[PDB]
Structure formats: structure tokens, C-alpha cells
Design a binder for these strands. Structure first.
Length: 175
RNA sequence: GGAUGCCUCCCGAGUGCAUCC
């Protein structure tokens, strides 16, 4: 994995995420509002995309130039409530079914990493979903790759974490 | 003649599908 695997490829890295748009009027509109703004703000919004019906909106800046001017002209705001400007992403966890991952179904409503990592081994990302606040009885895990995923998967596929031989399917694809 | 269910964990998530009554 020299250097890296997946990376960004656009006009310029200068990016920025917009959170807290307030899903009241209409996200689509909220994102646009910020758009038209970037247009009448004397510049050319490099990137402009949305994320999940009501998650957030991403955007790229022409460069320190257009970026500087923007920051200087706070204003922005969807309509009334302010928003958050920052780009912590750097990757993609959604719309990627966790490429090279493995989800575990059927839980004991009291499992953790002990029994989890216990059944698995090549699991780089161990996470369980089931703890009060509306139980679920389902755990999720990620693998450094599909190779180890399929192997371990089909392997532990038949275990016994809750007297029901916990479930474990694959999730993702490749890229 | 009728209609809906689902994709968990996880900051870009929507070229999204199936069957039943």
C-alpha cells in the first residue's frame, strides 16, 4: 500500500464541508442558497455536491485566493441560522458499502470485542450495534481487504456467540 | 385492478431493486 490507495482527483484540493443547514425549508434549496452565493460572491465554486437527503453539503474552493475572499465575507448562512465550515472527511464511508468489509448479524444483545475479535481475527474495524436506546442485536466489522474478509467470513460464518451461531455477511465491493 | 419492504455499524448516500394481494 505504498503512498496510498484511494485519493481525491479534482481541480484543487481546497475543500470545505457545510454542516447544520437546518433541514426545515428544503436541503436541496439550502445547498443551492450557499451555491448561488458562492457565485455572486465574486468567484467560481470549484466543487458543489450534497450528502444524504439531510446530512451536509461539500464544496471545493478555487484556491487560497477565492477561499480567502470567502472567509472574509462570512454572510453565507442557509437563511437565518449559521453553519459550520470545515472539511474532516478525506475519505468516503457511505455509498461504498464499506468496500472490503464484513457485517455480523444475530447478536446476544450483550456482545463486545471479546467475543467478536474472538471469533474473527483479521478484523481491523470491530464495531457492535446493540446497547439500550432501542436495541438492534446486530454487529458490524471491517476488513483490511476482501481476501481476508471472504476467508474469515465463510469461516466464522458458522460459530456460536449467542447459541444461534452469529451471522456474518460481506459488505462493500471494491472501490 | 391494488401496493409496499428494504440497504445496521460507520461525514460525498442514492445510474436502487423485488415480490405479493
Amino acid at each position: 500500500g505504498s503512498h496510498m490507495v484511494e485519493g481525491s482527483e479534482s481541480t484543487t484540493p481546497f475543500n470545505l464541508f457545510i454542516g447544520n443547514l437546518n433541514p426545515n425549508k428544503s436541503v436541496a434549496e439550502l445547498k443551492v442558497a450557499i451555491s448561488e452565493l458562492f457565485a455572486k460572491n465574486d468567484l467560481a465554486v470549484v466543487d458543489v455536491r450534497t450528502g444524504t437527503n439531510r446530512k451536509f453539503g461539500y464544496v471545493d474552493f478555487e484556491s487560497a485566493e477565492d477561499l480567502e475572499k470567502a472567509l472574509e465575507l462570512t454572510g453565507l448562512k442557509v437563511f437565518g441560522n449559521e453553519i459550520k465550515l470545515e472539511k474532516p472527511k478525506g475519505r468516503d464511508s457511505k455509498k461504498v458499502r464499506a468496500a472490503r468489509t464484513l457485517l455480523a448479524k444475530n447478536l446476544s444483545f450483550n456482545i463486545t470485542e471479546d467475543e467478536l475479535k474472538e471469533v474473527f481475527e483479521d478484523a481491523l474495524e470491530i464495531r457492535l450495534v446493540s446497547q439500550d436506546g432501542k436495541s438492534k442485536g446486530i454487529a458490524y466489522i471491517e476488513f483490511k481487504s476482501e481476501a481476508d474478509a471472504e476467508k474469515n467470513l465463510e469461516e466464522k460464518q458458522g460459530a456460536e456467540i449467542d447459541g444461534r451461531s452469529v451471522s456474518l455477511y460481506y459488505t462493500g465491493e471494491k472501490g
